[PDB]
Swiss-Prot record:
Member of the two-component regulatory system FleS/FleR that regulates the expression of multiple genes involved in flagellar synthesis, adhesion, swarming, motility and antibiotic resistance. May function as a transcriptional activator by direct binding to a cis-acting sequence upstream of the target genes. Disruption phenotype: Deletion leads to loss of motility due to the absence of flagella as well as swimming defect. In addition, mutant possessing pili adheres poorly to mucins. Residues 4-118 form the Response regulatory domain. It comes from the Bacteria. The lineage of its organism: Bacteria, Pseudomonadati, Pseudomonadota, Gammaproteobacteria, Pseudomonadales. This is Response regulator protein FleR. The modification 4-aspartylphosphate is found at D53. It comes from Pseudomonas aeruginosa (strain ATCC 15692 / DSM 22644 / CIP 104116 / JCM 14847 / LMG 12228 / 1C / PRS 101 / PAO1).
Length: 120
C-alpha cells in the first residue's frame, strides 16, 4: 500500500512537516532541499511520486519538471508553490505535471494527493 515519495523542498520547516505527513500515511520517502540534489537521488532509487517546490535557490521546479518528464516518462510529478500563477499552472499541466498546488495545504490533503497520483 506504501508509495515511495521523493520530496524536494528548500524550506526546512515545510520539508519536515511534509515528511511527518508522509510517514503518517505509511509511505516511504526521501527528502532533498534542491532540484540539483534530487537528480543524483533519482538515478539511485525508483520513486512512485515526486513532489517539488517551484521556487528554489537554484534550478526551479518547472525546470526539474521538464527534466523528469524527459528522463523518467513514467514518473508522476506534483508541483507546489507559495506564489501561484495561472499561466505557469497551465504550462506545468500542459507538460504533464500531475497537479499544481498553492501552499499551504493540510496533511490529509497531501495523503489524498499521493493516493490519487502515485504509481501503485
Ligand atoms: Ca522555496
Amino acid at each position: 500500500m506504501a508509495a515511495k515519495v521523493l520530496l524536494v523542498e528548500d524550506d526546512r520547516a515545510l520539508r519536515e512537516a511534509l515528511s511527518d505527513t508522509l510517514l503518517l500515511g505509511g509511505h516511504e520517502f526521501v527528502a532533498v532541499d534542491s532540484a540539483e540534489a534530487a537528480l543524483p537521488v533519482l538515478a539511485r532509487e525508483a520513486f512512485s511520486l515526486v513532489i517539488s517546490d517551484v521556487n528554489m535557490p537554484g534550478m526551479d521546479g518547472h525546470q526539474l519538471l521538464g527534466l523528469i518528464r524527459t528522463r523518467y516518462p513514467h514518473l508522476p510529478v506534483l508541483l507546489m508553490t507559495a506564489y501561484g500563477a495561472v499561466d505557469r499552472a497551465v504550462e506545468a499541466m500542459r507538460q504533464g505535471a500531475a497537479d499544481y498546488l498553492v501552499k499551504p495545504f493540510e496533511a490529509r490533503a497531501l495523503l489524498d494527493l499521493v493516493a490519487r497520483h502515485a504509481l501503485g
